[PDB]
């Protein structure tokens, strides 16, 4: 069966980062646009990072550009999430998905091939 799981979320204070891990299983992936979207409650889900297979495009969501940057380890079958300078507006839960169409993502997305169950990051500050 095929599965992408996040790893690598949880709590984290402002200003911090988190490099999320998505082990994504049970096929060939090499082929897939791989990215991250995120949603906190109330809000829709939204389409955070990607990157295409077939040549090296990437799409970054405004909110995240300079901050967040996705890569890939095709032998680890693993794709990556790398936060920094996080604020309390990053908190959600951050869905790892895999796609054949790169053009899927990204501020209007199309729906995706599979999607991992997503993990929680929450973003404290503290005065």
């Known amino acids: 069966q095929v599965q992408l799981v996040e790893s690598g979320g949880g709590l984290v204070q402002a200003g911090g980062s988190l490099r999320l891990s998505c082990a994504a299983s049970?096929?060939?992936?090499?082929?897939?646009?791989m990215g991250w979207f995120r949603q906190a409650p109330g809000k829709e889900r939204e389409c955070v990072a990607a990157?295409?297979?077939?040549?090296?495009?990437?799409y970054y969501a405004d909110s995240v550009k300079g901050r967040f940057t996705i890569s890939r380890d095709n032998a680890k079958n693993t794709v990556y999430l790398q936060m920094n300078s996080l604020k309390p507006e990053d908190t959600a839960v951050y869905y790892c998905?895999?796609?054949?169409?790169?053009?899927?993502?990204?501020?209007?997305?199309?729906?995706?091939?599979?999607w991992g169950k997503g993990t929680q990051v929450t973003v404290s500050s503290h005065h």
């Open positions: 990157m295409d297979w077939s040549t090296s495009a990437t």
């Open positions: 049970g096929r060939t992936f090499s082929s897939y646009a």
């Open positions: 998905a895999a796609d054949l169409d790169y053009s899927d993502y990204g501020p209007f997305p199309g729906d995706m091939d599979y």
